[PDB]
Structure 1
């Protein structure tokens, strides 16, 4: 039953690691999607629950699952400022240059929200500095528009 999928989604929002493990063991769908196309992995990536992220990956969660806006878990983790989660998603084979419905990569989202350390990690993992969104804007363009000089400077120099 997909009751268990809805329960797994709630557990992952609530940060209830023991409930996640016991729902997975009961044959919950690891890739259960809510109304907005968030998996448990997306939810844990947003809320910064690292132990939940790792246990979901170990149980076979789709690292490149898209929500209704085309955001992967890496988009979410990068946007939301969760460095350790970003590293873990990359190790597990997350697509560093995956594009959302605006054509924003994870680097775009990290640059836009001022997450310098996440910018540096994404560059090391082979993020495209020249990637343009649907309005023609690079990550550097975003960082500069948002007032994140430090990140704008790194991205100009990585180009």
Structure 2
């Protein structure tokens, strides 16, 4: 997936494959810091957990909501990632997006909040 060879990657999972890496919460939030949207597309297709905690129990939304990757947030929420998490000092990802200020993210956060409320 790093080299973008999905054809072999597709048949690799068919025969039985999985991702076994450490600090995945810290690793993935580094990827979203660079801003590359192509890289995160094929990771979620292989079942990677999007709610993995970082070194400070920081969800990827904490990095995502602060900077405001509204477009790079639809793919993550397609995996039913939790939005009721907390920051290191205590901050909801939906509240984190609201604090920074983003109308597009607020609507997305409200939809996530509505989905979370509906459960």
- Per the TM alignment, residue 81 of structure 1 is displaced from its structure 2 partner at its CA by 1.0
- 1:50-89: CA deviations, max 9, x gaps? 2111111112211110002111112221122111221111
| Contact 1:74 1:94 (8 Å CA) reproduced | no
> Does the Cα contact within 8 Å between 1:64 and 1:72 map onto a contact in 2?
yes
1:75 aligns with: 62
Structure 1 position 18, deviation (Å)? 4.8
Distance of 1:99 and 1:20 partners within structure 2: 33
- Give the number of the structure whose alpha-carbon radius of gyration is greater: 1
Aligned residue number for residue 99 of structure 1: 86
Aligned to 2:35: 48
Structure 2 gap ranges (5+): 115-119
| Cα contact 2:18–2:46 (8 A) shared by 1 | no
Instruction: Indicate the RMSD between aligned Cα atoms, in angstroms.
Output: 2.8
1:19 aligns with 2:3: yes
**Greater relative CO, 1 or 2 (CA 8 Å, sep 6+):** 2
Is 1:120–2:104 an aligned residue pair?
Answer: no
Q: How many residues align?
A: 107
The separation in 2 between residues aligned to 1:84 and 1:117, in whole angstroms, is: 9
TM-score (norm 2): 0.71
Partner Cα distance (1:95, 1:79) in 2: 17
Looking at structure 2, the residues matched to 118 and 30 of structure 1 have their Cα atoms a distance apart, in angstroms, of: 32
